[PDB]
């Protein structure tokens, strides 16, 4: 994912899950501040996010909260952790139907990002 190729977060996450469903994996929890722009209307990503090869991520909780929700409504978690959990849901068999970013205000370390999941 090259830098600033998507003019907003809505079109950025539409291709992020497309690559993840295609077998590509990402992990940027250690350099999160260097790849995430500010404000969801900014071009995404700020810097190119490299592909990882060693993607092994086993969370300490149930990533799929419900059968149609990544997190409980109002749950706050690290922005990088959102993408690791979103990838986990896609790997385990859940498809993304919509990512909740319409009224959110923060993107850096903690953000209230949520997704609607679907079968297959």
């Amino acid at each position: 994912i090259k830098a600033k190729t998507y003019p907003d977060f809505k079109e950025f996450v539409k291709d992020f899950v497309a690559n993840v469903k295609a077998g590509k994996r990402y992990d940027f929890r250690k350099y999160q501040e260097a790849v995430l722009p500010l404000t969801y209307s900014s071009p995404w990503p700020e810097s190119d996010i490299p592909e990882v090869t060693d993607f092994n991520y086993t969370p300490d909780y149930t990533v799929p909260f419900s059968e149609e929700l990544l997190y409980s409504v109002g749950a706050q978690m690290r922005t990088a952790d959102f993408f690791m959990d979103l990838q986990y849901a896609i790997i385990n068999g859940k498809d993304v139907d919509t990512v909740y970013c319409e009224w959110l205000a923060r993107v850096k370390p903690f953000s209230m990002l949520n997704a609607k999941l679907k079968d297959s």
Partner: peptide
């Protein structure tokens, strides 16, 4: 331009 706008929003 997004660069100037983002440099100035923060």
């Amino acid at each position: 331009h997004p660069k100037i706008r983002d440099a100035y929003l923060a």
